[PDB]
Amino acid sequence: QGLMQFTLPVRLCKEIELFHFDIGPFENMWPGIFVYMVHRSCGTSCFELEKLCRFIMSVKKNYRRVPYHNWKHAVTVAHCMYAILQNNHTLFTDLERKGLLIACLCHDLDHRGFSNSYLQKFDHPLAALYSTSTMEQHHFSQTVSILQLEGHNIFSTLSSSEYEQVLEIIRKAIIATDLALYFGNRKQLEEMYQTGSLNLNNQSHRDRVIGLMMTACDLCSVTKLWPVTKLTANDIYAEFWAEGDEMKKLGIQPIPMMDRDKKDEVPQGQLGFYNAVAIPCYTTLTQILPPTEPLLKACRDNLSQWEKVIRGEE
Ligand SMILES: Cc1nn(-c2ccc(Cl)cc2)c2sc(C(=O)N3CCCCC3)cc12
Ligand SMILES: [Mg+2]
Ligand SMILES: [Zn+2]
């Protein structure tokens, strides 16, 4: 039984190829959507179906019921990566194709809905184990834990060598989702691209480009149709405000972004974020990988919808 091609209904079969695809509210379809993407992106031969299924279900089990950093976010970020891989077929190694979809599914494993900042101020044990990229080193750790469960080793056929390469791709990919690291990473990529020194044969260059891809997938809620973007924003701020509440409980005025008393300032907050983070991210990404331009175009569409919100045209 290896003639077992997963297939989706027609509207999903078609719209899954597009950057702006929303995976829907039917939680029980998300595993199938992921397997579909791995099979098309990687091959039906990349992974042992029974092992992959058991891995996916343990990954699912280890996401929490938080408003935003949940299992739906995991599968959403994996679909953005699938769209990028599918639009840039010949640029990526076999090991990269395998590693990056798994990295994406695992990148926020066991997230509690709190920032690295909050962990450090609370004095969480994870803050003493991991001084920087606190939640991200934890996510990678939880990824290795699950790969080491009996019957969960989806990489079992790789050589000793290929196995260490793939786990090194996953680790770098996951650390890159720490937005604090994004700014420097993109500045370097921008300067490399413009002085023409960017070289996809330099592993250290590839590493930077995969990190940017990871930021791009991770922020991909800004690249959706406006109603998806707007409703996802509600989940994002549900977390931010809970953390604000927890800051207040520690005796700390949170930043306004996290203060639920300053709801009125959200639209302006989203402008800043689109201008300082999202637009620059998708701009540099489009410079390096031209077929990713639809993510930049959709982001720009959403910036303009937030400007309309401010001007009371909605
Ligand atoms: C405002 C705001 N909205 N979002 C947001 C919106 C959409 C998606 Cl799809 C995801 C996030 C975020 S994430 C973030 C942040 O952590 N920093 C810390 C590091 C430097 C930049 C600011 C700030 C904001
Ligand atoms: Mg994260
Ligand atoms: Zn994430």
- Report the 10 Å Cβ neighbour count for 5: 9
The number of residues in the chain equals 314
Q: Give the number of the atom of ligand 1 that is nearest the alpha carbon of residue 276.
A: 21
Residue ranges of alpha helices (H) inside 26-159 are 30-41, 49-61, 71-86, 94-106, 116-122, 125-129, 134-147
C-beta separation of 313 from 267 below 8 A: no
Residues with beta carbon inside 6 Å of ligand 1?
179-180, 219, 221-222, 236, 257, 269, 273, 277
The reply to whether 1 sits in an annotated binding site is: no
Q: Give the number of the atom of ligand 1 that is nearest the alpha carbon of residue 222.
A: 9
Cα–Cα distance measured from residue 105 to residue 219, given in angstroms and rounded to the nearest whole number: 14
- Cα–Cα distances (Å) from 42 to 25, 47, 89, 200, in that order, read 26, 9, 10, 20
Task: Please give the domain boundaries of the chain with CATH numbers for all domains.
Answer: 29-311 (1.10.1300.10)
Cα–Cα distance measured from residue 112 to residue 38, given in angstroms and rounded to the nearest whole number: 27
Cα–Cα distance measured from residue 135 to residue 133, given in angstroms and rounded to the nearest whole number: 6
Cα–Cα distance measured from residue 132 to residue 122, given in angstroms and rounded to the nearest whole number: 15
* Ion ligand 2 contact residues with beta carbon within 5 A: 108, 177
- CA end-to-end span of the chain, whole Å? 53
Resolution in angstrom units: 2.1
Shortest-distance ligand to the CA of residue 142 = 2
The closest residue, in CA terms, to atom 17 on ligand 1 is 179
Task: Tell me if residue 111 is catalytic.
Answer: no
The reply to whether 139 sits in an annotated binding site is: no
| Residue whose C-alpha is closest to residue 235's, from 105, 111, 58 | 111
Cα–Cα distance measured from residue 22 to residue 125, given in angstroms and rounded to the nearest whole number: 36
Cα–Cα distance measured from residue 223 to residue 110, given in angstroms and rounded to the nearest whole number: 25
